[PDB]
Design a protein around this ligand. Structure first.
Ligand code: HEM
Ligand SMILES: CCC(C)(C)C(=O)O[C@H]1C[C@@H](C)C=C2C=C[C@H](C)[C@H](CC[C@@H](O)C[C@@H](O)CC(=O)O)[C@H]21
Length: 404
């Protein structure tokens, strides 16, 4: 019998780091904003494949972010770790979501992020000194891409960087876990570490956002101790892994487009616009759109019923040709405005401007100090993460014109 189905398996893995999987490109090319897929357990779900409908549904209050809902579209067995756990505000709906998010916004405002630029530049150049002094070759992930945002978010959260080896390992084991067992164990490792940190800040008040939440909201019973752990865990893990993966993939992508990398190096005013285009193009968090409908929603003839899972795939929506002409082409000179790599609505990425600053400083630093940077292995030799997690590589062997 023929094997063609009306709801293809979802998600799919990338074979090229800066191109949609073949299964996503056909979903992008089907007409209409919605299309059925099949999750890992056999459940069917909706995916959004157009930019305007993705933007409209991300702001529709009839789509809930409640992870604990039984109908929430889980995309892997490892997802049972966050469902079975107390929720941070990413999995909350209004009004409870707003009261929790307000406790954290002070550390991510524009004026606070801009003020952090001297500190971030010191952090980037510090790890660039060490990598260049150790001689080629080098793993760009473990020696630069991961340590730089790790130290920045640790200073922002109040987490001691002296323990970086522990929680970096546990954060990997959680994000790239393939079964619920290794995911549960990694999450418990981070929870146990953070709970000890909370007790530590109750004896002597600490710094950062975690120290402030312990001395203020937790002391007044406005947040549960376990809510504080999930919130701190969310910020810690999002603070490391997203920026590290954007850096690794942005380096890979720019090295495969040397004409645009040359233009970027010649005119640094293009860096902020190239970051926006890289965010649209790469879209490393395109699974970050899971929703469950609480009421019936009509979208251009199609009907989402209450209790159905919806997955807004921002990587597909960022390749909408009616918004960005020739969407599959990298183009640092294009207007990448209104892209959905950071989401949209009340759950729009809290640390989107920290990531913009981190990537801007990092790209300028690599072009200033290692302009001869190239990949020590062919791109096809690299191992990409599957579509069930944050896009990126685990290793990135690089080399350069060395001398000292
Ligand atoms: C670097 C690339 C990044 C990308 C592509 C990205 C992407 C996203 C997306 C798409 C969402 C929406 C999730 C949803 O609607 O369910 C989101 C939310 C969020 N992100 Fe990011 N993010 C990045 C960096 C960061 C950083 C550096 C932080 C640091 C704290 C962060 C913290 C958060 C938080 C706390 C939320 C939840 C917002 C809310 O629920 O109100 N992200 N992110
Ligand atoms: C193992 C699955 C994994 C990768 C954590 C995940 O799919 O997340 C993704 C998808 C979606 C929620 C949005 C995301 C954007 C930024 C973050 C990095 C975020 C981590 C979500 C957070 O929920 C994970 C732990 O914090 C669990 C918890 O706090 O209960 C990430």
């Amino acid at each position: 019998t023929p094997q063609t189905t009306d709801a293809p398996a979802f998600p799919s893995n990338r074979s090229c780091p800066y191109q949609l999987p073949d299964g996503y490109a056909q979903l992008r090319d089907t007409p209409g904003p919605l299309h059925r897929v099949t999750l890992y357990d056999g459940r069917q779900a909706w995916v959004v494949t157009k930019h305007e409908a993705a933007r409209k549904l991300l702001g529709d209050p009839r789509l809930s972010s409640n992870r604990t809902d039984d109908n929430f579209p889980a995309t892997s067995p490892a997802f049972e770790a966050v469902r079975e756990s107390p929720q941070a505000f990413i999995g909350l709906d209004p009004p409870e979501h707003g009261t929790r998010r307000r406790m954290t916004i002070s550390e991510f405002t524009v004026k606070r992020i801009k003020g952090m630029r001297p500190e971030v530049e010191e952090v980037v150049h510090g790890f660039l000194d060490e990598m260049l002094a150790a001689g080629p070759t080098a793993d760009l992930v473990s020696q630069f891409a991961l340590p730089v945002p790790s130290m920045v978010i640790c200073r922002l959260l109040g987490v001691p960087y002296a323990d970086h080896e522990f929680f970096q390992d546990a954060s990997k084991r959680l994000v790239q876990s393939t079964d619920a067992q290794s995911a549960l164990t990694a999450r418990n490792d981070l929870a146990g570490y953070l709970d000890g940190l909370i007790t530590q800040f109750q004896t002597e008040p600490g710094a950062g956002l975690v120290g402030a939440l312990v001395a203020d909201q937790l002391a007044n019973g406005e947040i549960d101790r376990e809510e504080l752990i999930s919130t701190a865990m969310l910020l810690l893990i999002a603070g490391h892994e997203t920026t590290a993966s954007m850096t690794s993939l942005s380096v890979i992508t720019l090295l495969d487009h040397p004409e645009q990398y040359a233009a970027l190096r010649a005119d640094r005013s293009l860096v902020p616009g190239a970051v926006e285009e890289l965010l649209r193009y790469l879209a490393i968090a395109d699974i970050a759109g899971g929703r469950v409908a609480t009421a019936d929603i009509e979208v251009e003839g199609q009907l989402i019923r209450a209790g159905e899972g919806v997955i807004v795939v921002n990587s597909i929506a960022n390749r909408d040709g009616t918004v960005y002409e020739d969407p599959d082409a990298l183009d640092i000179h294009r207007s990448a405005r209104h892209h959905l790599a950071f989401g949209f609505g009340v759950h729009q990425c809290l640390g989107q401007n920290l990531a913009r600053l981190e990537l801007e400083v990092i790209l300028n630093a690599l072009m200033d100090r290692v302009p001869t940077l190239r990949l020590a292995v062919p791109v096809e030799q690299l191992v990409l993460r599957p579509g069930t997690t944050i896009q990126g590589v685990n290793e990135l062997p690089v080399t350069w014109h060395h001398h000292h």
